[PDB]
DNA sequence: TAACCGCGTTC
DNA sequence: TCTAGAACGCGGTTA
């Protein structure tokens, strides 16, 4: 078993060692050395220097295998090697009686003779243990093993003991007034991935330079930049059934385009491609050279052996694809099998336990994983086309997938130009955005490139936190586990959480820098601002700019200018002037709220443990059933008398024989019905204000990890802001200088956004499943604190201006043009400090009301002496003033629309576009193109009324297209304008009992093209709604648009069935469309974006063909 | 009406 | 196995 399972494992190792040697990775062993292990003597110690590019757990011999890690290097002489570190896996046993630890030692040493290599007593800091801040430590038994198989064996042997100790004890003599097994409290750090365990304990990181010596790896801090690995990026294109997805079973690979370190190549399957293709060039932009040599080949099998032999030739340590883990690689694998080729022996690639394709020597960098996790691009923009436009700054070749299989024979040169396009986009997307980010992150996260690319951002956070915990000798907590059911007030809870961010829609309509607005200034607010002005201006200098008032020359001049503008506002409250369209958002809001308040899971105390205590409030919110327990028990007992089908000799089971999970599942389903009948309600929501103790002396390893990564992000966010300033400094006539400045902006804005998701995942991680540091309190406290801060700022903006929209940590607003705006302190050095009074007036009050004055830190660690001080890193950040902001309005009375608007810069360019269907994936294309046309038009017009009039022209043009029953439009534009695409996250089978346009479109796509359409998840349901079944629900009139593309026989059969008209003969799309459905949809968009906002601003309906709601007509009447 | 769900956004 | 969070819009269905 163990030595036997070693066989698969030790055989796979020898195969990997052979594959590695083939690709240039011979296992290097450094010479012997009897001197000292001091890194100052790196040049004298015998060894080989290399750049660490990969690492993998392995099994080595010298009958059982020894656990270890292979480390893959690129040396300085243009070569490569790998070296192995062996390291005994280990986990700990915790005891509930510290005195009797030795007894447990003697038990487990005898009990685990089968697998235990060695045993030892160690101490670690336990953050749940009393007096741990005074130096006390938890005694633990460290169990070490020869390999991970043996570690797992001991886990299997120890779990029964852990279960028997949790259950009740056997009885025996009842008049009798403990054994070694019952002192085993728990096992700890048992589920750490072994290669992570080696990377943490040995402090080794991919992307650093080491010298492999006998005593170990020595980091060469002298070596600065990364070695340059051989990078290959490839894309595959294949034949496909008409209107259907390819099947590796039958379909063949036409061509494989790739690029190796900037040199383009293309291999062709001439049995499908008509002409031999000649070397051509696709350099989409000068920065992206693209000269492609062509390798035309006879059969598909020949194409595969050319791709496999070229890979063997160049020896790539990185292979990049776009969605290659789930399409390209699985195809090349299946086609290699059919042709009697083993891809492993060929190139060393194979699917792993997650079905992804990896190798030992070469990372597989699927750029689609980066786009999905670190781009911050909308899902509508996550395709290679949009990603190339967003990040590489050009348009790549496009080609209808329905024409690719035909164009293989009709125009194969156009097919070849498309494939190389997908290839140039993948190579340069990886080389400019992915490769720098992932390999740099590997320098601080103890994972290899493949894992650093694919692991969730919560897992990345966990990796970073474990390094800090280990290096501070802090015992790792076990992964959090949810109770199988929780209760509130006797009711079974369905779900609980905390109140998140505060969002407000305060005003809708058009706002522009040239159109006047009415402001009612609170004079008592101007008094407060004048009271606060001397200290706020000092706060702007000493805190916001990290200087001193003694070095500024014009502190008084600035103060007098602001005072004057402020007093003029106090004398003239009612004003009707031009607005300043500004946005203020707290930088890294939740993280800075956490680090300011010293928030971390281990700091949340329970009043049974821990001036020292900073009490903070959050809002709990639970959703429970209305049934009380007495009811709850009733259902259960009824279920206990029923029978349940077995999960595949015994055909039935009892309720108590089932899993406690599926039990609750049945209990839930039944309790739902009962309440619906007895209470006429299934869910009851309730909000409870809760308080938690946040100890300010706890070991701040978590808090400090968040501070560090915030500063890590701020570097790139600052560089992004620096280069946005450099771009406005350059003369427009110098194209090359503006281009490079733009390229810097996109690069640093990307790097800061990728760091933004990991940073904010330190907040989400405390609520993540399996979290080693779970705390609902900490998260709720963060959210409530942010909600209190933003409403404080909104209360002030209200009194000196008009807030338009608010979300969590940001406010959009308009201020009077006369409001104190931007100033520049002048320093004795000639330097200038920038001041935005609307920003600094808020930030001063933020620090007045939300500063942590109970923040403590170890001053003297040896004597356990703490010092208390004040901390506040919460700072609003101002952007603007903008040319225009356009906010939509709700169709229903008294309500607004949140999370949707459009903002325009002074130069007319689009600044922000939030929420609207234009950006969302799928949605009705008509609404998308209408929105794409309409928002820029809000800039036209000389008055508010001429503005709405210029927009109305575009509206009525679109309304005309639909009131014309699509006669003005050609056939092509019609199919694309009236199509609504929607993605099914799961598969149709997993949607039982649900009605949706996508579900119906999928069933019909299956009933027509076949079941093969609906086998996978993520199906795109392109449909049009038919008037066919009249007065019938819409989910019933959704026809797949592919129907109008098949042969006429198939169309009539299905259209008649879907229309319930066996007499139908006109199969034109224009005759099937329910143009009334789409006209209402267009009418709904025009109401929310144009007409109803115009009414709110006092403008009679600019599009009278779209009638106001009756509530609005009645409001206008009065 | 109001509750409720799937998707994809803004935070 | 691996797995960051909550608030919200909109087109639907359901009670
Ligand atoms: C964008 C985003 C935000 N949030 C939370 C935490 C953020 O502090 C809060 C505010 O969102 P943002 O203001 O978008 O994020 P931020 O304040 O951290 O970054 P920036 O400096 O660019 O303003 O919302 C997440 O939990 N996940 C996310 O993906
Ligand atoms: Ca492709
Ligand atoms: Ca921001
Ligand atoms: Ca923010």
mmCIF file with all atom_site columns, N, CA, C and O in Angstrom, chain A residues 545-583:
data_model
loop_
_atom_site.group_PDB
_atom_site.id
_atom_site.type_symbol
_atom_site.label_atom_id
_atom_site.label_alt_id
_atom_site.label_comp_id
_atom_site.label_asym_id
_atom_site.label_entity_id
_atom_site.label_seq_id
_atom_site.pdbx_PDB_ins_code
_atom_site.Cartn_x
_atom_site.Cartn_y
_atom_site.Cartn_z
_atom_site.occupancy
_atom_site.B_iso_or_equiv
_atom_site.pdbx_formal_charge
_atom_site.auth_seq_id
_atom_site.auth_comp_id
_atom_site.auth_asym_id
_atom_site.auth_atom_id
_atom_site.pdbx_PDB_model_num
ATOM 1   N N  . UNK A 1 545 ? 0.675   65.831 3.718   1.00 0.00 ? 545 UNK A N  1
ATOM 2   C CA . UNK A 1 545 ? 1.867   66.022 2.906   1.00 0.00 ? 545 UNK A CA 1
ATOM 3   C C  . UNK A 1 545 ? 3.160   65.746 3.660   1.00 0.00 ? 545 UNK A C  1
ATOM 4   O O  . UNK A 1 545 ? 4.240   65.906 3.078   1.00 0.00 ? 545 UNK A O  1
ATOM 5   N N  . UNK A 1 546 ? 3.081   65.337 4.927   1.00 0.00 ? 546 UNK A N  1
ATOM 6   C CA . UNK A 1 546 ? 4.248   64.939 5.718   1.00 0.00 ? 546 UNK A CA 1
ATOM 7   C C  . UNK A 1 546 ? 5.316   66.032 5.728   1.00 0.00 ? 546 UNK A C  1
ATOM 8   O O  . UNK A 1 546 ? 6.487   65.800 5.415   1.00 0.00 ? 546 UNK A O  1
ATOM 9   N N  . UNK A 1 547 ? 4.900   67.240 6.090   1.00 0.00 ? 547 UNK A N  1
ATOM 10  C CA . UNK A 1 547 ? 5.808   68.378 6.175   1.00 0.00 ? 547 UNK A CA 1
ATOM 11  C C  . UNK A 1 547 ? 5.548   69.099 7.496   1.00 0.00 ? 547 UNK A C  1
ATOM 12  O O  . UNK A 1 547 ? 5.009   68.535 8.457   1.00 0.00 ? 547 UNK A O  1
ATOM 13  N N  . UNK A 1 548 ? 5.939   70.371 7.556   1.00 0.00 ? 548 UNK A N  1
ATOM 14  C CA . UNK A 1 548 ? 5.725   71.205 8.728   1.00 0.00 ? 548 UNK A CA 1
ATOM 15  C C  . UNK A 1 548 ? 5.336   72.605 8.275   1.00 0.00 ? 548 UNK A C  1
ATOM 16  O O  . UNK A 1 548 ? 5.755   73.067 7.210   1.00 0.00 ? 548 UNK A O  1
ATOM 17  N N  . UNK A 1 549 ? 4.524   73.276 9.096   1.00 0.00 ? 549 UNK A N  1
ATOM 18  C CA . UNK A 1 549 ? 4.084   74.631 8.786   1.00 0.00 ? 549 UNK A CA 1
ATOM 19  C C  . UNK A 1 549 ? 5.261   75.599 8.771   1.00 0.00 ? 549 UNK A C  1
ATOM 20  O O  . UNK A 1 549 ? 5.206   76.639 8.105   1.00 0.00 ? 549 UNK A O  1
ATOM 21  N N  . UNK A 1 550 ? 6.354   75.264 9.459   1.00 0.00 ? 550 UNK A N  1
ATOM 22  C CA . UNK A 1 550 ? 7.496   76.168 9.520   1.00 0.00 ? 550 UNK A CA 1
ATOM 23  C C  . UNK A 1 550 ? 8.199   76.322 8.176   1.00 0.00 ? 550 UNK A C  1
ATOM 24  O O  . UNK A 1 550 ? 8.937   77.296 7.989   1.00 0.00 ? 550 UNK A O  1
ATOM 25  N N  . UNK A 1 551 ? 7.980   75.403 7.236   1.00 0.00 ? 551 UNK A N  1
ATOM 26  C CA . UNK A 1 551 ? 8.650   75.445 5.944   1.00 0.00 ? 551 UNK A CA 1
ATOM 27  C C  . UNK A 1 551 ? 7.788   76.026 4.827   1.00 0.00 ? 551 UNK A C  1
ATOM 28  O O  . UNK A 1 551 ? 8.304   76.250 3.727   1.00 0.00 ? 551 UNK A O  1
ATOM 29  N N  . UNK A 1 552 ? 6.503   76.275 5.073   1.00 0.00 ? 552 UNK A N  1
ATOM 30  C CA . UNK A 1 552 ? 5.622   76.830 4.051   1.00 0.00 ? 552 UNK A CA 1
ATOM 31  C C  . UNK A 1 552 ? 5.601   78.347 4.184   1.00 0.00 ? 552 UNK A C  1
ATOM 32  O O  . UNK A 1 552 ? 5.542   78.894 5.292   1.00 0.00 ? 552 UNK A O  1
ATOM 33  N N  . UNK A 1 553 ? 5.663   79.035 3.044   1.00 0.00 ? 553 UNK A N  1
ATOM 34  C CA . UNK A 1 553 ? 5.720   80.490 3.035   1.00 0.00 ? 553 UNK A CA 1
ATOM 35  C C  . UNK A 1 553 ? 4.336   81.130 3.018   1.00 0.00 ? 553 UNK A C  1
ATOM 36  O O  . UNK A 1 553 ? 4.127   82.165 3.660   1.00 0.00 ? 553 UNK A O  1
ATOM 37  N N  . UNK A 1 554 ? 3.382   80.532 2.304   1.00 0.00 ? 554 UNK A N  1
ATOM 38  C CA . UNK A 1 554 ? 2.088   81.151 2.046   1.00 0.00 ? 554 UNK A CA 1
ATOM 39  C C  . UNK A 1 554 ? 0.946   80.466 2.793   1.00 0.00 ? 554 UNK A C  1
ATOM 40  O O  . UNK A 1 554 ? -0.166  80.368 2.270   1.00 0.00 ? 554 UNK A O  1
ATOM 41  N N  . UNK A 1 555 ? 1.206   79.987 4.012   1.00 0.00 ? 555 UNK A N  1
ATOM 42  C CA . UNK A 1 555 ? 0.129   79.421 4.821   1.00 0.00 ? 555 UNK A CA 1
ATOM 43  C C  . UNK A 1 555 ? -0.971  80.447 5.060   1.00 0.00 ? 555 UNK A C  1
ATOM 44  O O  . UNK A 1 555 ? -2.162  80.114 5.026   1.00 0.00 ? 555 UNK A O  1
ATOM 45  N N  . UNK A 1 556 ? -0.591  81.706 5.292   1.00 0.00 ? 556 UNK A N  1
ATOM 46  C CA . UNK A 1 556 ? -1.582  82.737 5.578   1.00 0.00 ? 556 UNK A CA 1
ATOM 47  C C  . UNK A 1 556 ? -2.331  83.153 4.318   1.00 0.00 ? 556 UNK A C  1
ATOM 48  O O  . UNK A 1 556 ? -3.554  83.337 4.351   1.00 0.00 ? 556 UNK A O  1
ATOM 49  N N  . UNK A 1 557 ? -1.616  83.311 3.199   1.00 0.00 ? 557 UNK A N  1
ATOM 50  C CA . UNK A 1 557 ? -2.268  83.686 1.947   1.00 0.00 ? 557 UNK A CA 1
ATOM 51  C C  . UNK A 1 557 ? -3.329  82.665 1.558   1.00 0.00 ? 557 UNK A C  1
ATOM 52  O O  . UNK A 1 557 ? -4.461  83.029 1.215   1.00 0.00 ? 557 UNK A O  1
ATOM 53  N N  . UNK A 1 558 ? -2.982  81.378 1.616   1.00 0.00 ? 558 UNK A N  1
ATOM 54  C CA . UNK A 1 558 ? -3.950  80.326 1.311   1.00 0.00 ? 558 UNK A CA 1
ATOM 55  C C  . UNK A 1 558 ? -5.123  80.391 2.280   1.00 0.00 ? 558 UNK A C  1
ATOM 56  O O  . UNK A 1 558 ? -6.290  80.298 1.881   1.00 0.00 ? 558 UNK A O  1
ATOM 57  N N  . UNK A 1 559 ? -4.828  80.568 3.572   1.00 0.00 ? 559 UNK A N  1
ATOM 58  C CA . UNK A 1 559 ? -5.885  80.593 4.578   1.00 0.00 ? 559 UNK A CA 1
ATOM 59  C C  . UNK A 1 559 ? -6.837  81.760 4.351   1.00 0.00 ? 559 UNK A C  1
ATOM 60  O O  . UNK A 1 559 ? -8.056  81.610 4.491   1.00 0.00 ? 559 UNK A O  1
ATOM 61  N N  . UNK A 1 560 ? -6.302  82.927 3.989   1.00 0.00 ? 560 UNK A N  1
ATOM 62  C CA . UNK A 1 560 ? -7.157  84.087 3.761   1.00 0.00 ? 560 UNK A CA 1
ATOM 63  C C  . UNK A 1 560 ? -8.014  83.908 2.512   1.00 0.00 ? 560 UNK A C  1
ATOM 64  O O  . UNK A 1 560 ? -9.195  84.276 2.507   1.00 0.00 ? 560 UNK A O  1
ATOM 65  N N  . UNK A 1 561 ? -7.437  83.344 1.447   1.00 0.00 ? 561 UNK A N  1
ATOM 66  C CA . UNK A 1 561 ? -8.198  83.125 0.219   1.00 0.00 ? 561 UNK A CA 1
ATOM 67  C C  . UNK A 1 561 ? -9.362  82.172 0.458   1.00 0.00 ? 561 UNK A C  1
ATOM 68  O O  . UNK A 1 561 ? -10.485 82.419 0.004   1.00 0.00 ? 561 UNK A O  1
ATOM 69  N N  . UNK A 1 562 ? -9.109  81.073 1.172   1.00 0.00 ? 562 UNK A N  1
ATOM 70  C CA . UNK A 1 562 ? -10.178 80.131 1.498   1.00 0.00 ? 562 UNK A CA 1
ATOM 71  C C  . UNK A 1 562 ? -11.219 80.801 2.384   1.00 0.00 ? 562 UNK A C  1
ATOM 72  O O  . UNK A 1 562 ? -12.426 80.726 2.122   1.00 0.00 ? 562 UNK A O  1
ATOM 73  N N  . UNK A 1 563 ? -10.754 81.486 3.418   1.00 0.00 ? 563 UNK A N  1
ATOM 74  C CA . UNK A 1 563 ? -11.690 82.149 4.351   1.00 0.00 ? 563 UNK A CA 1
ATOM 75  C C  . UNK A 1 563 ? -12.601 83.067 3.541   1.00 0.00 ? 563 UNK A C  1
ATOM 76  O O  . UNK A 1 563 ? -13.820 83.019 3.751   1.00 0.00 ? 563 UNK A O  1
ATOM 77  N N  . UNK A 1 564 ? -12.018 83.868 2.650   1.00 0.00 ? 564 UNK A N  1
ATOM 78  C CA . UNK A 1 564 ? -12.813 84.808 1.868   1.00 0.00 ? 564 UNK A CA 1
ATOM 79  C C  . UNK A 1 564 ? -13.881 84.083 1.058   1.00 0.00 ? 564 UNK A C  1
ATOM 80  O O  . UNK A 1 564 ? -15.067 84.430 1.123   1.00 0.00 ? 564 UNK A O  1
ATOM 81  N N  . UNK A 1 565 ? -13.477 83.070 0.286   1.00 0.00 ? 565 UNK A N  1
ATOM 82  C CA . UNK A 1 565 ? -14.444 82.299 -0.491  1.00 0.00 ? 565 UNK A CA 1
ATOM 83  C C  . UNK A 1 565 ? -15.496 81.666 0.409   1.00 0.00 ? 565 UNK A C  1
ATOM 84  O O  . UNK A 1 565 ? -16.673 81.585 0.041   1.00 0.00 ? 565 UNK A O  1
ATOM 85  N N  . UNK A 1 566 ? -15.089 81.218 1.599   1.00 0.00 ? 566 UNK A N  1
ATOM 86  C CA . UNK A 1 566 ? -16.039 80.613 2.527   1.00 0.00 ? 566 UNK A CA 1
ATOM 87  C C  . UNK A 1 566 ? -17.025 81.646 3.059   1.00 0.00 ? 566 UNK A C  1
ATOM 88  O O  . UNK A 1 566 ? -18.223 81.362 3.180   1.00 0.00 ? 566 UNK A O  1
ATOM 89  N N  . UNK A 1 567 ? -16.545 82.851 3.375   1.00 0.00 ? 567 UNK A N  1
ATOM 90  C CA . UNK A 1 567 ? -17.433 83.885 3.902   1.00 0.00 ? 567 UNK A CA 1
ATOM 91  C C  . UNK A 1 567 ? -18.431 84.348 2.849   1.00 0.00 ? 567 UNK A C  1
ATOM 92  O O  . UNK A 1 567 ? -19.606 84.574 3.158   1.00 0.00 ? 567 UNK A O  1
ATOM 93  N N  . UNK A 1 568 ? -17.979 84.503 1.601   1.00 0.00 ? 568 UNK A N  1
ATOM 94  C CA . UNK A 1 568 ? -18.889 84.846 0.512   1.00 0.00 ? 568 UNK A CA 1
ATOM 95  C C  . UNK A 1 568 ? -20.015 83.826 0.388   1.00 0.00 ? 568 UNK A C  1
ATOM 96  O O  . UNK A 1 568 ? -21.149 84.187 0.053   1.00 0.00 ? 568 UNK A O  1
ATOM 97  N N  . UNK A 1 569 ? -19.726 82.556 0.675   1.00 0.00 ? 569 UNK A N  1
ATOM 98  C CA . UNK A 1 569 ? -20.768 81.536 0.659   1.00 0.00 ? 569 UNK A CA 1
ATOM 99  C C  . UNK A 1 569 ? -21.720 81.687 1.838   1.00 0.00 ? 569 UNK A C  1
ATOM 100 O O  . UNK A 1 569 ? -22.910 81.375 1.715   1.00 0.00 ? 569 UNK A O  1
ATOM 101 N N  . UNK A 1 570 ? -21.222 82.162 2.983   1.00 0.00 ? 570 UNK A N  1
ATOM 102 C CA . UNK A 1 570 ? -22.087 82.343 4.145   1.00 0.00 ? 570 UNK A CA 1
ATOM 103 C C  . UNK A 1 570 ? -23.012 83.542 3.977   1.00 0.00 ? 570 UNK A C  1
ATOM 104 O O  . UNK A 1 570 ? -24.124 83.544 4.515   1.00 0.00 ? 570 UNK A O  1
ATOM 105 N N  . UNK A 1 571 ? -22.574 84.566 3.242   1.00 0.00 ? 571 UNK A N  1
ATOM 106 C CA . UNK A 1 571 ? -23.428 85.726 3.012   1.00 0.00 ? 571 UNK A CA 1
ATOM 107 C C  . UNK A 1 571 ? -24.478 85.446 1.945   1.00 0.00 ? 571 UNK A C  1
ATOM 108 O O  . UNK A 1 571 ? -25.620 85.907 2.058   1.00 0.00 ? 571 UNK A O  1
ATOM 109 N N  . UNK A 1 572 ? -24.116 84.695 0.909   1.00 0.00 ? 572 UNK A N  1
ATOM 110 C CA . UNK A 1 572 ? -25.017 84.365 -0.192  1.00 0.00 ? 572 UNK A CA 1
ATOM 111 C C  . UNK A 1 572 ? -25.271 82.860 -0.161  1.00 0.00 ? 572 UNK A C  1
ATOM 112 O O  . UNK A 1 572 ? -24.601 82.078 -0.837  1.00 0.00 ? 572 UNK A O  1
ATOM 113 N N  . UNK A 1 573 ? -26.258 82.455 0.641   1.00 0.00 ? 573 UNK A N  1
ATOM 114 C CA . UNK A 1 573 ? -26.599 81.040 0.744   1.00 0.00 ? 573 UNK A CA 1
ATOM 115 C C  . UNK A 1 573 ? -27.197 80.524 -0.558  1.00 0.00 ? 573 UNK A C  1
ATOM 116 O O  . UNK A 1 573 ? -26.714 79.539 -1.130  1.00 0.00 ? 573 UNK A O  1
ATOM 117 N N  . UNK A 1 574 ? -28.247 81.177 -1.041  1.00 0.00 ? 574 UNK A N  1
ATOM 118 C CA . UNK A 1 574 ? -28.926 80.749 -2.259  1.00 0.00 ? 574 UNK A CA 1
ATOM 119 C C  . UNK A 1 574 ? -28.102 81.203 -3.458  1.00 0.00 ? 574 UNK A C  1
ATOM 120 O O  . UNK A 1 574 ? -27.876 82.401 -3.654  1.00 0.00 ? 574 UNK A O  1
ATOM 121 N N  . UNK A 1 575 ? -27.641 80.241 -4.257  1.00 0.00 ? 575 UNK A N  1
ATOM 122 C CA . UNK A 1 575 ? -26.801 80.520 -5.412  1.00 0.00 ? 575 UNK A CA 1
ATOM 123 C C  . UNK A 1 575 ? -27.243 79.648 -6.577  1.00 0.00 ? 575 UNK A C  1
ATOM 124 O O  . UNK A 1 575 ? -27.742 78.536 -6.390  1.00 0.00 ? 575 UNK A O  1
ATOM 125 N N  . UNK A 1 576 ? -27.041 80.170 -7.795  1.00 0.00 ? 576 UNK A N  1
ATOM 126 C CA . UNK A 1 576 ? -27.420 79.490 -9.037  1.00 0.00 ? 576 UNK A CA 1
ATOM 127 C C  . UNK A 1 576 ? -26.259 79.675 -10.018 1.00 0.00 ? 576 UNK A C  1
ATOM 128 O O  . UNK A 1 576 ? -26.272 80.559 -10.877 1.00 0.00 ? 576 UNK A O  1
ATOM 129 N N  . UNK A 1 577 ? -25.240 78.824 -9.888  1.00 0.00 ? 577 UNK A N  1
ATOM 130 C CA . UNK A 1 577 ? -24.000 78.990 -10.633 1.00 0.00 ? 577 UNK A CA 1
ATOM 131 C C  . UNK A 1 577 ? -23.556 77.652 -11.211 1.00 0.00 ? 577 UNK A C  1
ATOM 132 O O  . UNK A 1 577 ? -24.219 76.623 -11.045 1.00 0.00 ? 577 UNK A O  1
ATOM 133 N N  . UNK A 1 578 ? -22.414 77.681 -11.895 1.00 0.00 ? 578 UNK A N  1
ATOM 134 C CA . UNK A 1 578 ? -21.861 76.484 -12.503 1.00 0.00 ? 578 UNK A CA 1
ATOM 135 C C  . UNK A 1 578 ? -21.371 75.516 -11.427 1.00 0.00 ? 578 UNK A C  1
ATOM 136 O O  . UNK A 1 578 ? -20.963 75.934 -10.341 1.00 0.00 ? 578 UNK A O  1
ATOM 137 N N  . UNK A 1 579 ? -21.403 74.214 -11.705 1.00 0.00 ? 579 UNK A N  1
ATOM 138 C CA . UNK A 1 579 ? -20.987 73.242 -10.691 1.00 0.00 ? 579 UNK A CA 1
ATOM 139 C C  . UNK A 1 579 ? -19.568 72.738 -10.887 1.00 0.00 ? 579 UNK A C  1
ATOM 140 O O  . UNK A 1 579 ? -18.988 72.858 -11.971 1.00 0.00 ? 579 UNK A O  1
ATOM 141 N N  . UNK A 1 580 ? -19.003 72.174 -9.825  1.00 0.00 ? 580 UNK A N  1
ATOM 142 C CA . UNK A 1 580 ? -17.774 71.397 -9.889  1.00 0.00 ? 580 UNK A CA 1
ATOM 143 C C  . UNK A 1 580 ? -18.148 69.940 -9.662  1.00 0.00 ? 580 UNK A C  1
ATOM 144 O O  . UNK A 1 580 ? -18.634 69.586 -8.583  1.00 0.00 ? 580 UNK A O  1
ATOM 145 N N  . UNK A 1 581 ? -17.944 69.104 -10.677 1.00 0.00 ? 581 UNK A N  1
ATOM 146 C CA . UNK A 1 581 ? -18.320 67.695 -10.611 1.00 0.00 ? 581 UNK A CA 1
ATOM 147 C C  . UNK A 1 581 ? -17.114 66.931 -10.072 1.00 0.00 ? 581 UNK A C  1
ATOM 148 O O  . UNK A 1 581 ? -16.186 66.603 -10.813 1.00 0.00 ? 581 UNK A O  1
ATOM 149 N N  . UNK A 1 582 ? -17.134 66.640 -8.774  1.00 0.00 ? 582 UNK A N  1
ATOM 150 C CA . UNK A 1 582 ? -16.014 66.023 -8.084  1.00 0.00 ? 582 UNK A CA 1
ATOM 151 C C  . UNK A 1 582 ? -16.402 64.652 -7.548  1.00 0.00 ? 582 UNK A C  1
ATOM 152 O O  . UNK A 1 582 ? -17.580 64.366 -7.307  1.00 0.00 ? 582 UNK A O  1
ATOM 153 N N  . UNK A 1 583 ? -15.389 63.808 -7.358  1.00 0.00 ? 583 UNK A N  1
ATOM 154 C CA . UNK A 1 583 ? -15.545 62.496 -6.748  1.00 0.00 ? 583 UNK A CA 1
ATOM 155 C C  . UNK A 1 583 ? -14.513 62.354 -5.640  1.00 0.00 ? 583 UNK A C  1
ATOM 156 O O  . UNK A 1 583 ? -13.338 62.684 -5.836  1.00 0.00 ? 583 UNK A O  1
#
